[PDB]
């Protein structure tokens, strides 16, 4: 029974989706997870639940990879994509009882996903990146879900102005890993410096002889360490042996060469991209062509930070990589602010790759299910019946939102089909400032079609070592 | 309880319904059944199969209770209602999980059933108002569908005309009332089906006692009919709580044959032989009523109350020998239309007689609904597909909670054409989607699943019709049964002492 | 659950009679609780009726075998085995072959017409030279007497049954031939007599030989016949009046007298097997014959009764239909070619259903070679290659072990017998394929 | 299906090997204790297999084979069981080679027919006209019985009894027509042939009985003389018998009522009508054959045409015997039969004497069907194997190997004869095959002879037995 073995994995996969189903939305139910090490963590984020769940089931681990790609591409909807995946698995259970092979089930999802996107783009309102008033109100609403509210007014133009410089035109995917959120102890939320050139994670030399400032400097990346025309050099942090000898600090001080040591190993790959330089393993291969370009290098300390900033890289291959600096008093300030602004950059990232926006709250899922139900008569054969089950599987997202909010399940869903007939995208979430970008709803359906496909295509599993 | 019985009532109905799913249609199953009285027969009739099924679950007992009342109205729609009612319970199970009360499902199917009736009437066609010349061919070919799965299919051309006259005689054009008690179904072993004849009167299984008595009654020089005597008192000398005096009352009244409920002595056959007066013995109380109605007679309580006006008059009385059978029964016909018609079928085996008898009785029930309503609809799956597309389209226009109750009713009607497609060797999903495309983009018509082998769609050319009152009676009983099942949330079964 | 029990339960029915098919077949033994009723017989009808079966689907083949026994009386084993082979292959047609069950039914319907057309094209009859037609009746009688103890003297019994049917010239009714079984003497001592030997005498003391007798079934009659017994005094009074009274005349004896006479020239009384017999002579156009078989024991006679009655029932049908076909595995081989011939143009779902019927036609001669001690897969495959393309004459030989002609060896079959087997067996298989569930009412 | 046959062959081989030890007079005796507590001891194979109550269905067929062995040949009931098991033991290796039992069964029938012609060519041709070998055959066969010196006079009495009923082409003759009546008293030296008939009982011992009558009629009458005035009812019974002049009355023995009333004895004494009562039911069919009469149930069925004729009916005076004899039946339609009276002082004498005469009449009857005799002691079993050695090379196919195994199974019979005698099994058999180049059938000087029908029927019955054993492929319960 090769199909019955797969049905056992489908039931186990739907059980995971039912656990995440209660956590959907800000009013969703939290989940308590106790790790084997003894750490007790709790949260409503579906991405953090599936990461620490330590699923031993081979097929159920696909939801973790989809949730990882959901946050890496769209950045939002990691919880809803798991529920949407379980809906197609439940709809395919009745298909297997009718004698339908999963290939037709998987192939029809490709035509259903591409059709759902084209229908979604018809009702979507196309927006342009040249309008700065739309991007401020879009990121400001995403910051209302956190403790910081009144201080988020100055954080809205911070995320908008950083993307517009690197957006250009027809950039398609824009990696947010190049945008670094600098978390330093001290200061306040209202104190922020863009410093579009670059921002490091480390301080300067506190010993005697260190210039700490240099004009017209070339910054290279050196993975080597000095232990028993380059103005500024970087030394990789190594706790095993000594990084930079005290005698070497006095030697380079006479040569008017600024030294910054103890560079974090995580930022080595980050600085090799935005600065457009190359890592130098050995001094024998160390040349001038691998250096950077900096007009002025200075160390500016607001309060206690003692951080060095660089501006005007002016590199042809490299681009204006911007690092955002975040200040705050308590540790819980710069932390929650980091995750809040990270989700704001993901919403802006969705508008750059795909223009247009829609109103959230399960509004498009109702009309798409209505249009696909009427268009199902245009097809013929087994594929025609799949369009009817695919439309019913899209109604689980708006139904769960009504269940987790305390409202009547079946009553609110009927009110959606009734109001959406006369009006178009009017139900009002636009007056409530609820805006979900179209790329999130597009990626949630696209990744669900590939996730359910990779499930049904497994007809058996055996021990392999 | 609520969280328990509501789930168990759905699984209990699917177990019994799944047995007769493969038995639906002419391609279904003929099941072997053995009655406790000793009668053995093989037929696909749902009323007989469901009645023989005896189980302790209370959900399936409602099927027998409904089929018992439906057997008198139709009797051939037992397999159609159970499958249709089970499809409503399958869609009702999903509505319960969505937070809909079970009483809403009962009221949801009520408005959905009445809405689908008006949609079917608009697409319905009429016989008498359209073509009168084909009215004869409609009644003849309607019985051919039910007789195609039996040995009757070879001689079906002869029995097609016999079922038409039997229904019309027991009914009136204006009243359109047909009673099963007025139609007698009898048969004996021996002979073949080609010798079966239609009888306009009772049978009584009488050999006319002594063989010297005449086996045929003469009109006696143009008299009025044939006078028969009816006696509610036994034959014997009067005693407080004579044979020559009681025979004179029969001779003066002119009764040729005497019918009595009690036996006769040996001297009775001696005196009745000289006067050529055949005798009848051991007639049940129910058979005494059918004689006076067909022969236009009266019930005479006493001996001296006889008279020419109270004697039933028939066309003639003759004894026709049937094969080698030693019974040698009688046949009493009438020239005028009577209220009693007796069907008589012969067969080479006892199992063949009972097989063709109930097959002919099913044809009498189909014609009964065809004459009740001149308007007929196209069956074979085309009725359920047409009624489903009308409810599904109007479901979006009807808002509220009942919007989902209307969509589930349209999907429940699709079970019938998919069930017939599974028994015909075709894709149930592919055929269902094909029938919807032919009735939408091309033109509005009735095209059902093919019960008999053919090379294309559009069975309308084959002139296969079903009665509108028959199909409407099925959806009303299926809706009434589905509501009654939802009205029982608890099953109380007492133990045995 | 019901389909698994109906398919396996019906194969077990064919596995009981699988050794009773063919002249080389074997005998099956049965034992009851009393253990003293055990009897060794190869009769297929006796095995099916004696063995009780709790399977309701298996009881269907029992009643169908009774209908086949009434028409002919032989070949009942081949009908059950052929019906079992169709169900054994149907298990593979449903599960792994993806075929609708009704399609399997329609597949056998189209395949049955091809099997009947193969027998029609292979049926050859000779109206001229009645001596050649008489030899065909001899070869058919040898196949009917096969599998029975009479096969020893069957060479002498071949002319006994052949010459008996030629003396009828009339209705196929078997009431003309009366079988009398007397103990003593070898089986080869049996003879054919048209004189209507009677097993009962007449009167207490009356003359044995009677001339110019007038037979009257109940006047000036020399012979009297009564169904009941006779009282003492009139039995003596009938002797003085010259009227001889016959007693103990059953319903079967009266029907045989109505087909002969009335008057008769000579009534002679003979003594054979220590019992008075009556041999009539000088009847009016006598169509009736009498076969007297001499067995060693009662058990030999009891098996010879139905053996001769079934052999004469097939020869009686050969008068209406003179067409004959070649048997001994050759008849089933020719029909196997017509099935694959019509398989060239066929639908998708009906292809494997009809092709499975072709392999089922070769399962009957496969068992015939099993009980013969030979290799079925080796011998049938060599014959199948010759029958494949043209030149179809020879058939399976159960004696030497090589491929020899059935016409030269004297093995032929009747056309009416084969068309009845292919028909009844096809109708018997269609009933069991339809039933996916069995529901039994609560008994009292 | 081989598991059913292999289980029956092994079960039947254990029965044949158990009876194998009982072959010969020196063989091992088998004991059977019935559930009722009775214990029997004897070497007879027909008695052991009958009282064993074998539950195995196929093994019960050995009883029917042993029954026909004594009914036809009359000897070799133990040898036919050994030969049957010898073919079953050899068939075990035949099934291991992949041979279907049909070829195994068909080859035994062809080998049994060819083995008969081999024995007839080596047999000594004798005829029934020579009484020299007929007397010596029955005299030497009685050396195993209590009778020794008196057996010399018993041989010619059995020879002349068979020669009258043997004729020429009559072939098989029913042995039930020969009745041996044993009675206490007398001796063996006193014998009377009495070819007419002999009854099993005495005559009326009451007063008035004549006990002797000359020129009387004998007939079978199932009636009984009993009371219902009583002398008038019995007078009409005796008067109707006088109408047909029947002076000898034979009444079937029944425990219901009596035979003849004492009042009727005085009536029949004046008419000189002899009465013999207590006629057993077994003698009812016997008297209806030799006498040519018919059993008469009622008094109205009694007629003169069904009565026979008797020269002199008398009751011979003897000590504790009083045997009645009838001579001169004078019936042309009924053939004569032989009924011999056996007398002796001890009850154990007349018992074994009757059984000893049974084996003497069978061997003589063997010469009636097929003339000639073959010296026993393993000579016919080895001689057949000598001829089949060179004939097996002339065959082809699967049957060629069967002829070699068929001759090997025939060596079991002479091997058992050497084992039960204490001599070395193989050593004695090799000495017989060594001299086979010179001598052939040579036991002739020891006056030990065996008829050819015993050796012929033992091979024929064992060939059909084993043939029917392999025909059962299944065992089912049918009630």
Curated annotation (Swiss-Prot), chain B:
PANTHER family named among the record's database cross-references: CHAPERONIN
A GO CC annotation given for this chain: chaperonin-containing T-complex
Cellular compartments annotated: Cytoplasm
Gene: CCT5
Source organism (scientific name): Saccharomyces cerevisiae (strain ATCC 204508 / S288c)
Name this protein carries in UniProt: T-complex protein 1 subunit epsilon
SUPFAM superfamilies: GroEL apical domain-like, GroEL equatorial domain-like, GroEL-intermediate domain like
Top-rank lineage group of the source organism: Eukaryota
Family: Belongs to the TCP-1 chaperonin family.
Any one GO MF annotation of this record: unfolded protein binding
GO biological process, one term: chaperone mediated protein folding independent of cofactor
Keywords, alphabetical: ATP-binding, Chaperone, Cytoplasm, Nucleotide-binding
Record note on quaternary structure: Heterooligomeric complex of about 850 to 900 kDa that forms two stacked rings, 12 to 16 nm in diameter.
Function: Molecular chaperone; assists the folding of proteins upon ATP hydrolysis. Known to play a role, in vitro, in the folding of actin and tubulin. In yeast may play a role in mitotic spindle formation.
Swiss-Prot record, chain C:
Pfam families: Cpn60_TCP1
GO biological process: chaperone mediated protein folding independent of cofactor; protein folding
Tagged with keyword Nucleotide-binding: yes
InterPro entries (UniProt xref): Chap_CCT_beta, Chaperone_TCP-1, Chaperonin_TCP-1_CS, Cpn60/GroEL/TCP-1, GroEL-like_apical_dom_sf, GROEL-like_equatorial_sf, TCP-1-like_intermed_sf
Key word ATP-binding present: yes
Domain of life: Eukaryota
Compartments where located: Cytoplasm
Entry's Gene Ontology molecular function annotations: ATP binding; ATP hydrolysis activity; ATP-dependent protein folding chaperone; unfolded protein binding
SUPFAM superfamilies linked: GroEL apical domain-like, GroEL equatorial domain-like, GroEL-intermediate domain like
Keywords from the UniProt entry: Acetylation, ATP-binding, Chaperone, Cytoplasm, Nucleotide-binding
GO cellular component: chaperonin-containing T-complex; cytoplasm
Family that this chain belongs to: Belongs to the TCP-1 chaperonin family.
Record function comment: Molecular chaperone; assists the folding of proteins upon ATP hydrolysis. Known to play a role, in vitro, in the folding of actin and tubulin. In yeast may play a role in mitotic spindle formation.
Subunit and partners: Heterooligomeric complex of about 850 to 900 kDa that forms two stacked rings, 12 to 16 nm in diameter. Interacts with PLP2; this interaction leads to inhibition of CCT complex mediated actin folding.
Name recorded for this polypeptide: T-complex protein 1 subunit beta
Organism: Saccharomyces cerevisiae (strain ATCC 204508 / S288c)
Gene: CCT2
Curated annotation (Swiss-Prot), chain D:
One GO term describing the cellular component: chaperonin-containing T-complex
InterPro entries registered for this protein in UniProt: Chap_CCT_delta, Chaperone_TCP-1, Chaperonin_TCP-1_CS, Cpn60/GroEL/TCP-1, GroEL-like_apical_dom_sf, GROEL-like_equatorial_sf, TCP-1-like_intermed_sf, TCP-1_chaperonin
UniProt entry keywords in alphabetical sequence: ATP-binding, Chaperone, Cytoplasm, Nucleotide-binding
Location of the protein in the cell: Cytoplasm
Any GO BP annotation: chaperone mediated protein folding independent of cofactor
CDD domains referenced in this protein's UniProt entry, alphabetically: TCP1_delta (cd03338)
Keyword field contains ATP-binding: yes
Pfam families from the UniProt entry: Cpn60_TCP1
Record bears the keyword Isomerase: no
Molecular function GO terms recorded: ATP binding; ATP hydrolysis activity; ATP-dependent protein folding chaperone; unfolded protein binding
Function: Molecular chaperone; assists the folding of proteins upon ATP hydrolysis. Known to play a role, in vitro, in the folding of actin and tubulin. In yeast may play a role in mitotic spindle formation.
Protein family: Belongs to the TCP-1 chaperonin family.
Something else known: Present with 5530 molecules/cell in log phase SD medium.
Subunit composition and interactions: Heterooligomeric complex of about 850 to 900 kDa that forms two stacked rings, 12 to 16 nm in diameter.
Name the UniProt record assigns to this protein: T-complex protein 1 subunit delta
Gene assigned in the entry: CCT4
């Amino acid at each position: 029974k090769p199909q019955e073995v797969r049905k056992a994995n489908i039931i186990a996969a739907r059980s995971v989706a039912d656990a995440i189903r209660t956590s959907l939305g800000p009013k969703g139910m939290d989940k308590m997870i106790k790790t084997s090490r003894g750490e007790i963590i709790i949260s409503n984020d579906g991405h953090t639940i599936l990461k620490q769940m330590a699923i031993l089931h081979p097929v159920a681990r696909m939801l973790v990879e989809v949730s990882a790609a959901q946050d890496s591409e769209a950045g939002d909807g990691t919880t809803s994509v798991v529920i949407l995946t379980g809906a197609l698995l439940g709809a395919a259970e009745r298909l297997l009882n009718k004698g339908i092979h999963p290939t037709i089930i998987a192939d029809s999802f490709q035509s259903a996903a591409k059709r759902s996107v084209d229908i979604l783009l018809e009702m979507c309102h196309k927006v342009s990146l040249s309008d700065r008033e739309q991007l401020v109100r879009a990121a400001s609403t995403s910051l209302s879900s956190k403790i910081v509210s009144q201080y988020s007014s100055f954080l809205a133009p911070l995320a908008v102005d950083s993307v517009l410089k690197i957006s250009d035109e027809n950039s398609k995917n824009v990696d947010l890993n190049d945008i670094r959120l600098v978390k330093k102890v001290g200061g306040t939320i209202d104190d922020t410096e863009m410093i579009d050139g670059v921002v490091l994670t480390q301080t300067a030399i506190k010993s005697a002889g260190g210039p700490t400032r240099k004009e017209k400097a070339k910054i290279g990346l050196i993975q080597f360490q000095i232990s028993p025309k380059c103005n500024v050099l970087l030394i990789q942090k190594s706790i095993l042996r000594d990084a930079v000898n005290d005698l070497a600090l006095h030697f380079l001080s006479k040569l008017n060469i600024m030294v910054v040591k103890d560079i974090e190993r995580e930022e080595i790959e980050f600085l090799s991209k935005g600065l457009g330089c190359k890592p130098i393993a050995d001094i024998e291969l160390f040349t001038e062509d691998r250096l950077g370009s900096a007009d002025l290098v200075e160390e500016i300390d607001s309060d206690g930070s003692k951080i060095v900033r660089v501006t005007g890289i002016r590199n042809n291959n490299a681009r204006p990589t911007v690092s955002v600096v975040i200040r705050g008093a308590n540790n819980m300030i710069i932390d929650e602010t980091e995750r809040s602004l990270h989700d704001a950059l993901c919403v802006i990232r969705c508008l750059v790759k795909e223009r247009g926006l829609i109103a959230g709250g399960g509004a498009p899922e109702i009309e798409i299910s209505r249009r696909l139900s009427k268009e199902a008569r245009s097809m013929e054969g087994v594929q025609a019946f799949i369009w009817q089950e695919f439309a019913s599987a899209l109604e689980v997202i708006p139904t769960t939102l009504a269940e987790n909010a305390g409202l009547n399940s079946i009553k609110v869903v009927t009110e959606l089909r009734s109001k959406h007939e006369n009006g178009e995208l009017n139900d009002n979430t636009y007056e409530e400032h609820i805006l979900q970008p179209v790329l999130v709803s597009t990626s949630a359906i696209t990744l669900a079609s590939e996730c359910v496909k990779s499930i049904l295509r497994i007809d058996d599993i055996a021990f392999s070592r | 309880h609520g969280l328990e019985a509501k789930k168990s009532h759905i699984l209990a109905a699917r177990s019994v319904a799944s047995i007769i799913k493969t038995s639906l249609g002419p391609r279904g199953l003929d099941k072997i059944l053995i009655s406790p009285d000793g009668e053995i027969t093989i037929t696909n009739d749902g009323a007989t199969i469901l009645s023989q099924m005896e189980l302790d679950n209370e959900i399936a007992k409602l099927l027998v209770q409904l089929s018992k009342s439906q057997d008198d109205e139709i009797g051939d729609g037992t397999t159609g209602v159970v499958v249709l009612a089970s499809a409503l319970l399958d869609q009702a199970l999903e509505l319960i999980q969505k937070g809909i009360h079970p009483i809403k499902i009962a009221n949801g199917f009520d408005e959905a059933a009445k809405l689908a009736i008006s949609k079917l009437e608009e697409t319905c066609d009429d016989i008498s108002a359209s073509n009168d010349e084909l009215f004869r061919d409609f009644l003849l070919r309607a019985a051919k569908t039910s007789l195609g799965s039996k040995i009757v299919s070879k001689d079906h051309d002869r029995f097609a005309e016999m079922a038409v006259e039997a229904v019309i005689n027991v009914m009136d054009k204006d009243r359109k009332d047909v009673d099963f008690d007025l139609i007698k179904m009898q048969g004996r072993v021996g002979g073949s089906i080609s010798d079966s004849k239609l009888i306009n009167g009772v049978i009584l299984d009488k050999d006319f006692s002594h063989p010297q008595m005449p086996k045929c009654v003469l009109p006696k020089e143009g008299s009025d009919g044939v006078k028969l005597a009816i006696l509610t008192c036994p034959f014997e000398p009067p005693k407080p709580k004579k044979f020559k005096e009681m025979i004179d009352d029969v001779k003066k009244a002119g009764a040729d044959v005497v019918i009595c409920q009690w036996g006769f002595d040996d001297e009775a056959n001696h005196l009745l032989l000289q006067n050529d007066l055949p005798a009848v013995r051991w007639v049940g109380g129910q058979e005494l009523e059918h004689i006076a109605i067909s022969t236009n007679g009266r019930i005479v309580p006493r001996f001296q109350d006889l008279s020419k006006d109270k004697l039933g008059t028939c066309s003639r009385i003759y004894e026709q020998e049937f094969g080698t059978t030693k019974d040698r029964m009688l046949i009493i016909e009438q020239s005028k239309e009577t209220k009693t018609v007796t069907c008589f079928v012969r067969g080479s085996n006892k199992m063949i007689v009972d097989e063709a008898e109930r097959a002919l009785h099913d044809s009498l029930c189909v014609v009964r609904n065809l004459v009740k309503d001149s308007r007929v609809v196209y069956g074979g799956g085309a009725a359920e597909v047409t009624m489903s597309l009308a409810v599904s389209e109007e479901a979006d226009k009807q808002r509220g909670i009942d919007q989902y109750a209307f969509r589930g009713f349209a999907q429940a009607l699709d079970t019938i054409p998919m069930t017939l497609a599974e028994n015909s060797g075709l894709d149930p999903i592919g055929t269902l989607s094909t029938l919807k495309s032919k009735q939408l983009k091309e033109k509005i018509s009735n095209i059902g699943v093919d019960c008999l082998g053919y090379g294309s769609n559009d069975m309308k050319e084959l002139f296969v019709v079903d009665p509108f009152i028959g199909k409407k009676q099925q959806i009303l009983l299926a809706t009434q049964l589905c509501r009654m099942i939802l009205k029982i949330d608890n099953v109380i079964i007492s133990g045995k002492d | 659950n019901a389909r698994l029990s109906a398919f396996v339960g019906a194969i077990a029915v064919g596995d009981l009679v699988k050794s009773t098919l063919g002249p080389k077949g074997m005998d099956k033994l049965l034992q009851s609780a009393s253990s003293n009723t055990c009897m060794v017989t190869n009769d297929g009808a006796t095995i099916l009726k004696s063995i009780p079966l709790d399977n309701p689907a298996a009881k269907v083949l029992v009643n169908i075998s009774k209908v086949q026994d009434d028409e002919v009386g032989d070949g009942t084993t081949s009908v059950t085995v052929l019906s079992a082979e169709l169900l054994r292959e149907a298990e593979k047609l449903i599960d792994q072959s993806k075929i609708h069950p009704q399609t399997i039914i329609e597949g056998y319907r189209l395949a049955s017409a091809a099997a009947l057309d193969a027998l029609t094209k292979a049926a050859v009859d000779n109206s001229h030279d009645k001596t050649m037609f008489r030899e065909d009746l001899i070869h058919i009688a040898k196949t009917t007497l096969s599998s029975k103890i009479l096969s020893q003297d069957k060479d002498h019994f071949a002319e006994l049954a052949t010459n008996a049917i030629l003396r009828l010239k009339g209705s196929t009714n078997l009431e003309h031939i009366q079988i009398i079984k007397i103990l003593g003497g070898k089986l080869s001592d049996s003879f054919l007599d048209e004189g209507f030997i009677l097993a009962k005498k007449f009167g207490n003391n009356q003359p044995k030989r009677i001339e110019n007798a007038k037979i009257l079934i109940a006047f000036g009659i020399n012979t009297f016949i009564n169904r009941q017994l006779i009282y003492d005094y009139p039995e003596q009074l009938f002797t003085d009046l010259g009227i001889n009274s016959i007693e103990h005349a059953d319903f079967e004896g009266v029907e045989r007298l109505a087909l002969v006479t009335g008057e008769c020239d000579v009534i002679e009384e003979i003594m054979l097997g220590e019992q008075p017999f009556l041999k009539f002579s000088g009847c009016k156009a006598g169509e009736a014959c009498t076969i007297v078989l001499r067995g060693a024991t009662d058990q030999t006679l009891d098996e010879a009764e139905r053996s001769l009655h079934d052999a004469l029932s097939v020869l009686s049908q050969t008068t209406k239909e003179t067409r004959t076909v070649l048997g001994g595995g050759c008849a089933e081989m020719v029909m196997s070619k017509a099935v694959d011939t019509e398989a060239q143009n066929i639908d998708g779902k009906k292809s494997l259903a009809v092709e499975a019927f072709a392999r089922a036609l070769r399962q009957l001669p496969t068992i015939l070679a099993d009980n013969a001690g030979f290799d079925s897969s080796e011998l049938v495959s060599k014959l199948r290659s010759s029958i494949y393309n043209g030149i179809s004459t020879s058939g399976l030989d159960l004696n030497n072990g090589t491929i020899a002609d059935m016409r030269q060896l004297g093995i032929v079959e009747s056309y009416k017998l084969k068309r009845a087997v292919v028909s009844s067996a096809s109708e018997a298989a269609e009933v069991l394929l339809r039933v996916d569930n069995i529901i039994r009412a609560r008994p009292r």
